[PDB]
Design a protein around this ligand. Structure first.
Ligand SMILES: CC(=O)N[C@@H]1[C@@H](O)[C@H](O[C@@H]2O[C@H](CO)[C@H](O)[C@H](O[C@H]3O[C@H](CO)[C@H](O)[C@H](O)[C@H]3O)[C@H]2O[C@@H]2O[C@@H](C)[C@@H](O)[C@@H](O)[C@@H]2O)[C@@H](CO)O[C@H]1O
Ligand SMILES: [Ca+2]
Ligand code: NA
Length: 351
């Protein structure tokens, strides 16, 4: 059960670079120069056999004596640090005195735990192929430092720590939209299951509750994914359910032949749904019901209901065992016509 956190999705406690222009800063998820210029170029290194590889995540800097990027990792339980290292393909390397990096170092708590000295005794040039390194982290480590040594000049020393991440072994994962998009071990998506039956609050009964799509767009033949507001940002979902709330509407699952321990989903209104400004909620509440018994209700934490501009909230409820039947109940706001709900990434943990 491996958990990862990219360094570019964190905050450094300190960061230095070897560019004279101190208004420029260390670039997250981009090369140093192109990033500071506002260009959209991504991090690119050389894998085996002069093969160019592009990366979404990483850190981009200019080496100094040394350039140092430090992260505070006190009591976070990390075990491994892993990254590609090398000079970016975008580096200004027409001059031989450009893109010449002496050394790359990983330091943990004042101790150098990795040095590129062994693999690269002549350091890195513009054409040197990337090194993928895995650096062990001691039990109670506090501070990790990425260090790049420029040598005689900093020119073209566009050092990238491509795909840089910190790794640990956790018991249970922490639920995020990306985790539900990537998958979870033992998590079965409801949209990959058959319900006993389902009802909705739309008059057109030729329409049906939708799998991996919002209700109306799904019923019209659109293949667009579910999209929700998560902490102010619009976030797509690969899996989920699209339905219309009623008095309530319901979707029924038979779990009498299984050992389901958990129901997990984000719940909100799809970004493509019709809405109107109102003091009143679009959806009054959403309930999870285990054998006629309500085990979760959204009004326990959202008593006013949910509007279009409400951030999708996370439902993560324990399922009592020997549960035969699970019911998902969607309740109309009653004052508007907007009744369309989506369950983003909806899944059962079978354990
Ligand atoms: C007119 C004039 O002479 N202007 C000076 C300018 O030449 C000089 O710019 C730097 O020139 C050196 C060679 O002498 C290098 O080519 C620098 O570029 C390279 O190195 C940096 C990091 O050290 C970075 O990796 C660049 O991408 C890489 O191309 C030049 O510096 C770069 O350009 C200038 C214009 C600024 O934007 C810098 O912030 C940038 O790093 C500078 C520095 O001596 O002084 C000018 O007066
Ligand atoms: Ca150099
Ligand atoms: Na409504």
């Amino acid at each position: 059960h491996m958990a990862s956190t990219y360094l570019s999705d964190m905050d450094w406690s300190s960061a230095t670079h070897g560019d004279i222009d101190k208004t420029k800063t260390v670039q997250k998820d981009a090369p140093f120069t192109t990033g500071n210029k506002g260009e959209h170029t991504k991090i690119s290194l050389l894998t085996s056999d002069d093969k160019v590889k592009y990366f979404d995540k990483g850190i981009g800097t200019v080496a100094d004596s040394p350039s140092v990027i430090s992260y505070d990792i006190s009591g976070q339980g990390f075990e491994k640090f892993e990254t590609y290292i090398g000079i970016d393909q975008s580096a200004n390397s027409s001059r031989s005195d450009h893109a010449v990096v002496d050394r790359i170092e990983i330091e943990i708590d004042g101790k150098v735990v990795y040095s590129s000295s062994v693999t690269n005794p002549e350091g890195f040039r513009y054409n040197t192929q990337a090194q993928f390194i895995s650096v062990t982290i001691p039990q109670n480590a506090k501070k990790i430092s990425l260090k790049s040594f420029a040598g005689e000049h900093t020119w073209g020393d566009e050092v990238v720590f491509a795909d840089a991440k910190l790794i640990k072994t956790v018991s249970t994962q922490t639920i995020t939209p990306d985790l539900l998009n990537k998958g979870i071990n033992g998590g079965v998506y409801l949209s990959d299951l058959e319900w006993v039956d389902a009802t909705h609050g739309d008059d057109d009964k030729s329409k049906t509750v939708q799998k991996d799509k919002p209700f109306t767009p799904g019923n019209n033949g659109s293949n667009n994914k579910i999209k929700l507001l998560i902490d102010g940002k619009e976030v797509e979902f690969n899996k989920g359910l699209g339905t219309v709330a009623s008095n309530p509407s319901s979707i029924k699952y038979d779990v009498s032949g299984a050992n389901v321990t958990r129901f997990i989903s984000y719940v909100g209104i799809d970004r493509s749904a019709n809405h109107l400004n109102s003091d009143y909620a679009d959806i009054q509440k959403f309930e999870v019901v285990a054998d006629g018994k309500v085990i979760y209700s959204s009004d326990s934490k959202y008593p006013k209901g949910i509007k279009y501009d409400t951030s999708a909230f996370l439902v993560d409820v324990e399922i009592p065992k020997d549960t035969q039947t699970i019911e998902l109940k969607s309740y109309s706001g009653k004052h508007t016509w907007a009744d369309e709900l989506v369950l983003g990434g909806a899944l059962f943990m079978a354990n």
